Amino acid sequence: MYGDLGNKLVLEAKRTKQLYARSNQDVNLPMYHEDIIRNILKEVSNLRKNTEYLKEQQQLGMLDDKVAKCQYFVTLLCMERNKRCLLAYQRLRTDILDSMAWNNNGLDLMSSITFSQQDTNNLSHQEQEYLKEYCDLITDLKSGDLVDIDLSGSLVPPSDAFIDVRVLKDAGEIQTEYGVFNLIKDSQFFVQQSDVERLIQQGYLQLI
Amino acid sequence: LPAHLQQTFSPEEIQFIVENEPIKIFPRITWQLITTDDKALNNMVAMRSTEVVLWIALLLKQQSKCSIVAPQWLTTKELDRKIQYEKTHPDRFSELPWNWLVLARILFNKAKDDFHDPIHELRGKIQDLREIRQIKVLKGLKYLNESHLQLDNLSLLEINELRPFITEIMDKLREIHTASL
Amino acid sequence: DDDNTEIIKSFKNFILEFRLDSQFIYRDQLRNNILVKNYSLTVNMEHLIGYNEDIYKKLSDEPSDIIPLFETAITQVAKRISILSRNSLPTFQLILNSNANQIPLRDLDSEHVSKIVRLSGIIISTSVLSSRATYLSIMCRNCRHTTSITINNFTVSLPRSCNCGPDPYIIIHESSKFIDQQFLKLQEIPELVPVGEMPRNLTMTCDRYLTNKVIPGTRVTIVGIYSIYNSKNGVAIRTPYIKILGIQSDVETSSIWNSVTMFTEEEEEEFLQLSRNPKLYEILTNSIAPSIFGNEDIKKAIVCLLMGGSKKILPDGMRLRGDINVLLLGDPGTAKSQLLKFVEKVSPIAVYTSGKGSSAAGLTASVQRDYLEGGAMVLADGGVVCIDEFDKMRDEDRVAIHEAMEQQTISIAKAGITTVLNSRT
Amino acid sequence: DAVFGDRVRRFQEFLDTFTSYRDSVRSIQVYNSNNAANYILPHRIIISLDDLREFDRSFWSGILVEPAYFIPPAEKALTDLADSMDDVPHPWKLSFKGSFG
Amino acid sequence: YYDIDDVLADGTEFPCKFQYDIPGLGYNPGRPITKNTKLSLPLWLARILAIVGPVPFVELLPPDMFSTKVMNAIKTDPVALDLHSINSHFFSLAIKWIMLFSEKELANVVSELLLQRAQELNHHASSTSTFLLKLEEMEKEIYKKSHESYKDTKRWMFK
Amino acid sequence: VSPQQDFSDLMKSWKNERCSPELLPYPHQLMKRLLNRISMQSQLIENISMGFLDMQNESKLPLLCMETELERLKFVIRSYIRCRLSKIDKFSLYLRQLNEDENSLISLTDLLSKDEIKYHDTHSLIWLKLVNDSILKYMPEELQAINDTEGSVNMIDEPDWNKFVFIHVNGPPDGENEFGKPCYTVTIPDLKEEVELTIGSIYVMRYEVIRDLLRDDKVAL
């Protein structure tokens, strides 16, 4: 009853892992809960308020009682508990997030972060600032190599090395890089793994 | 963020690895290329065997410009001595190329017409040697203790399939026991 | 019996060498079945007839003399797979389901007897399990001959030879291996071909791993052999039954488990997406009666009913309950009697009984003798019950109701059972 | 059937080490003689399955897997121990508590 | 720690009675809590209250889950035992309580149970039925990981 | 110094990386000569591909070969570093505590890449900045610092040296560490008596007992 709201919150955190697990991974997190954590923050503010109040009270009334210690001990733990929840949730949220910023940006010619992440505005803007700052953070890693990467893609090794892509209602032709593949619905291109990696992440290509 | 798997290798990645092993070939051809890691070759002579890396043999086999040799250990008459030697030492896993599963998948997709008596035989043999060996692993897996195991000679694929399991419940098992002293 | 060796060699060669490109479907069907401890195999006849036409030529000829040589043939294979040496391993049941040509129930008349027959009908009721035997030891009353009889199937009398006689053989039940049996009884589907006559029902014996595979009332398509048993009731007049190997239910029809206390994942997702609607209440109140117009208070009341309520177990033993009650009473055209049909559909577990109950089932909890026979208040415990003609219900059970609805528990003192159960309805 | 003898000599040992049951048998033998001195108890000794695993797992798995070959030699052993009790002036019954299941 | 299983593991209630009186009850109008009151506490706070004192603040009364009846019943048939019903956390939990109370005896017990489940879980690692329903949450997670390695290695096996 | 060897060491590093529970030293001496080498051949192949069109009013094979090869090796390192950056994402705190302490070896220019160090500090920064305007406002006074309380704990974890890793024992025999009967190495676990180790057989154990064997590359993972 004391710290249990955090147990319920992480209990809810669990279900997003369930949605990232088997899964199938489309992202589409329901929302970030600002309300329930606001409840948590009001509860914890309550706590630390009574804490500094009693911290004033030992200075006068309690007179360093053996019992007093407990309040600064036990209730202190509760603060930690909320923290233990609040970060555990939060890191989970960053884990479901940064990976998404990994596997697709997105990809050639990124060329900008847009239309991605169906959560969009529904997810908190505090995370989105972190996010845009994070893909800005990875643009520098993109700019060191020079390898080249091409890192966001090709988690799965090339074979061999030409494939066949069957158009999937995409228009097209938007293939400007390397060559004008001239995208055309109902058209399969006997194209090398090279531009396939880049174009398959967008949603144009279908069968590898 | 590798996502999957991530701690264990991917089934594909172990083929990605094994294709780095060289094996002999029979080139139809008679630039340069230095490439990087190959070291080979002076222009390959037709009707002459030579040693090259796998992924290139496979590559040149799709174009049917080269005929891969069968490994001396891949034969049914050869496999017979191996299952014979395996039934009779229920404890040890015998002697394995260590890639044999994955070469058994790969060389059968394309090269199949090159083998002498490939049909309905060897696949029957290795699907078997990949049976009694697997159950022998599950019955050798009861003896689990921390920290030791002899997995002796065991395929890379066989390692990779059961890895999360063993190296997870070893991490629940050894975790109480280290910590209870 | 070198011929049985010749047949079984062909069955082994059918299991070990079969290739669908390139996995061996059967051989792995086997392993993946012994590990979960299923001890069964399902052959797909099309693959069978593809492999050899011959063995299917004999298997559609005299099935009941062959199929057990196929069982022993496959269990002799699981010996070389599931274990290795140099126990105990029951001889697996095979379940073969295949397309062929559907033979309707009415059209079964002799002539195909002992020839595999695929067909389709709605199961009426499932008979209570009983064991047949598989391997049983037997000792003599006099010379004490110890005989281990392997009974197969494919009724079978015991051997009289080691005065002695006439049949001095006792069944040792301390060592005897037993299997199970079911007895489905199936009424052919109402669409075809009833005409003007009541549809016939052929009695079927499921066994081993097909047993309890099917909830009574679900449409199915049985395969099995067709055969006849005696059962004195002349002359001679032997009566028809269908042995089943093996059963396959229709894809949809309560295949189970449609009632899982957890559901899936994406469902929590979309639910928790529905909890975020401001008009959630309002949109729900629009779901219930697409057809029924007006009556908004009733319309909302149903909603608040289905969702249950506060339930307290607080000490002492007295427990308050949920959820409430609703009266639709009024002159016809109220659609209430239809509305109930709707609630009955929506509610997770619900029983519509207007009576006086109906028809032969007592209004809810009911005492029937061989015990609780299970009824509305019972069969529909932990959920919604729909009643009509509430004022037209009998007295003796009216008492029962009145006492039930408040404390959720009904006490039955009838005859040799004094039970005090629980209706959470 | 020396093995049925084995079952009896095996179940013997289980009793009196540990002796936690024997006191109850003694109690049964005494109470009825107290009724003999007066001026009803069924004769059976409840065996907790709890204790059986500590001594032998081999004999524990047997009572569950094949009770026909095991319960009666254990029983004949219980009578045999009830007769070595005190003194003169019946098959009994096992019970099996458990530790289910 | 950050993983959800641990922070959820700390959420579980234990029957721990107070060694001392503590006015300023945070649970209601006591105001103090009388000595030797039995109050259920989650593990997170109760964990360091048994250490800090040289007499600790709480007795640590053994949880109903660890009742010697249970630790006995798990020595019969673990494979058919239902863990998911009792807590459901066991290994995530029990691992803490074995260190907290420093009990050796049951290590050898649970170290056995977890082999016996796993010699069963390599059996459902091959491609459920009812059984998957009775695993402990964390153990269940390992089942996902294994089943996925196998499934993926089979899907790689052919085309 | 040979290309093939740098590659074998690249693969070796890649496997040892995805196996082990924790981070490994950043091997710049090699990885940089490969990051120069690929910049060379990627320019070279585009040059020969462009010069090829001049003889055109033949055989695309060594070009296709070459290019496929380059796709393979440009995959390898990209897996590598895409993995290490993840372990940095998990160990950021631990590494921080490892940096503030003197002993023994901190990040420097070695333990992490000159590229990786940026990723580390920036990620760390923007992470702290995220949690700062999110849940610490509203800031507990004791919890101001991200570090051990202790308990529980936090992180600290996870330099976990006891985790199990499949290991395959390989290395040149002198006939150093071979005590018989078959061969090297010791072993000497702290909790248990030596097995000890046989070279033709893979033996799974803790990462800590073998870390020195790992350093020497006397056992592959």
- Are F85 and F171 contained in the same domain? no
Amino acid occupying residue D90? H
Q: What CATH number is given to the structural domain containing F75?
A: 1.20.58.1030
Structure tokens at A120: 């969009």
What is the 3-class SS of F71-104, one letter each residue? HHHHHHHHHHHHHHHHHHHHHHHHHHHHHHCCCC
Angle, nearest 10°, between helix axes B100-109 and B156-179? 150
Residues C96 and C222: their CA atoms lie apart, in Å, by: 10
Please give the order of strands across the beta sheet that includes C219-222: C226-229, C239-243, C201-205, C184-188, C119-126, C219-222, C248-249
Which residues span the domain enclosing F221? 158-221
Q: Count how many residues are written for chain C.
A: 425
E1 to F151: CB separation less than 8 angstroms, yes or no: no
Domain tally, chain F: 2
C330 among annotated binding-site residues: yes
* Contacts (Cβ under 8 Å, ≥6 apart) of F75: A154, A157, A158, B16
The tokens 């001049």 sit on which residue? F54
CB atoms within 10 A of CB B87: 14
E-assigned strand segments in chain E:
13-17, 38-42
Question: Within 10 Å of residue A104's Cβ, how many Cβ atoms?
Answer: 18
Fold of E1-159: Methane Monooxygenase Hydroxylase; Chain G, domain 1 (1.20.58)
User: Does one domain contain both F186 and F150?
Assistant: no
The Cβ of residue F32 has, within 10 Å, a number of other Cβ atoms equal to 12
Q: Is residue B74 packed enough to be buried (19+ CB in 10 Å), middle (13-18) or exposed (0-12)?
A: buried
Query: B70 in the Ramachandran plot: left (φ > 0), alpha (ψ -120 to 50) or beta?
Result: beta
**Distance from C-alpha of D19 to C-alpha of D7, rounded to nearest angstrom:** 18
The phi and psi torsions of E38 (rounded to 5 degrees) equal: -95, 110
Q: Rounded to an integer, what distance in angstroms lies between the CA atom of residue A55 and that of residue A32?
A: 35
Q: B33: cis peptide before it, omega within 30°?
A: yes
Instruction: Tell me C274's DSSP state.
Output: H
Which chain C residues touch A26 with a CB distance below 8 Å? none
For chain B, the DSSP string reads: ---SS-SSPPHHHHHHHHTTSEEEEEE-------TTTT---SPPPTT--EEEEHHHHHHHHHTT-EEEPPPTT-SHHHHHHHHHHHHT-SSS-----SSHHHHHHHHHHSGGGTSSS-TTTHHHHHHHHHHHHHHHHHHHGGG-BTTB----S--HHHHHHHHHHHHHHHHHHHHHHHHT-
The one-letter code for the residue type at B10 is S
Scan residues 133-152 of F and list those with Cβ closer than 8 Å to A.
133-135, 137-138, 140-143, 149
Between β-strands B50-53 and B66-68, what pairing exists: parallel, antiparallel or unpaired?
unpaired
CB of E25 within 8 Å of a chain A CB? The answer is no
Nearest in space to B151 (alpha carbons), one of E38, F168, A103, F90: F168
Q: Which residues of E touch B5 (CB under 8 A)?
A: 148-149, 152
Q: State which H helix or E strand residue C345 sits in.
A: helix C336-346
Resolution in A: 4.7
Asked if residues F68 and F45 have their Cβ atoms less than 8 Å apart, the reply is no
Closest by CA to C76, choosing from C164, C15, C21, C149, is C15
In the block, tokens 């012994």 appear at C34
The region, left, alpha or beta by phi > 0 then psi within -120 to 50, assigned to residue C102 is: beta
Nearest C-alpha neighbor of E58 from the set E42, E73, E74, E78: E42
Q: Is E151 on the interface with B (CB under 8 A)?
A: no
* Rounded Cα gap, residues C392 and C388, in angstroms: 8
Which one of B127, B132, B135 has the shortest CB-CB distance to C24? B127
- DSSP code, position F148: -
Instruction: Confirm if F203 and B149 have CB atoms less than 8 A apart.
Output: yes
Cβ-contact C116, C63 below 8 angstroms: yes
DSSP 8-state code for residue C391: G
The CA distance from B145 to F191, in Å, is 13
Looking at residue C127, the DSSP 8-state letter turns out to be P
Alpha carbons within 13 angstroms on the beta-carbon side of residue C20 total 14
Q: Is A9 helix (H, G, I), strand (E, B) or coil?
A: helix
The C-alpha atoms of residue B153 and residue B145 are separated, in whole angstroms, by 19
- Where does A65-124 have alpha helices with state H? 68-103
Q: Give the pair of three-digit tokens for residue A62.
A: 């309690």
The neighbour count for residue C43, using CB atoms within 10 Å, is 24
Which residue, among F89, F152, F153, would best test binding to E if mutated, counting the most E CBs under 10 Å from its CB? F152
CB E115 within 8 A of CB E107: no
Q: How many residues does chain D have?
A: 101
Q: What is the CA radius of gyration of chain B?
A: 20
Which tokens is A100 given?
A: 């998404």
The Cα A82–Cα C353 span in angstroms is: 52
CATH tag, D1-101: 3.30.1640.10
The answer to whether B96 and B118 are in contact (CB under 8 A) is no
Boundary of a domain, candidates F157, F172, F207: F157
As a whole number of angstroms, the distance between CA C289 and CA A203 comes to 41
Task: Inspect the structure and tell me whether chains C and E have 3 or more CB pairs less than 8 Å apart.
Answer: yes
- CB–CB of F209/F189 below 8 Å? yes
Q: Of F74, F3, F75, F60, give the one whose Cα is nearest residue F33.
A: F3
State which of F104, F132, F157 marks the end of a domain.
F157
- Sign of the C-alpha dihedral computed for residues C187, C193, C197 and C200 taken in this order: negative
Is F24 in the same domain as F128?
yes
Query: Residue C384's closest CA among C301, C323, C335, C300?
Result: C323
Most distant pair of Cα atoms in chain B: their distance: 70
| A143, D20, D21, D51, D98 from D48: Cα distances, Å | 74, 11, 9, 6, 6
What letter would DSSP give residue C62? S
Domain boundaries, chain D: 1-101
The answer to whether residues F166 and F75 belong to one domain is no
Q: What is the largest CA-CA distance in chain D?
A: 49
* Contacts of F among chains (3+ CB pairs under 8 A): A, B, E
CB-nearest to E75 from D53, D100, D101 is: D53
DSSP string of C138-154? EEESSS--EEEEE----
Name the closest residue on chain D to residue E81, using Cα atoms.
Answer: D101
Q: Is F34 in the same domain as F82? A: yes
Q: How far is CA C223 from CA A172, C219, C267, C392, in A?
A: 53, 13, 36, 48
Domain edges within chain B: 1-181
Report the distance separating Cα F215 and Cα F25, nearest Å: 10
DSSP letter (8 states) at residue C113 = T
Q: Residue B8 is which amino acid?
A: T
Tokens 């109850």 correspond to D24
Task: Tell me how long chain B is.
Answer: 181
Burial-class residue F153 by CB neighbours within 10 Å (0-12, 13-18, 19+): exposed
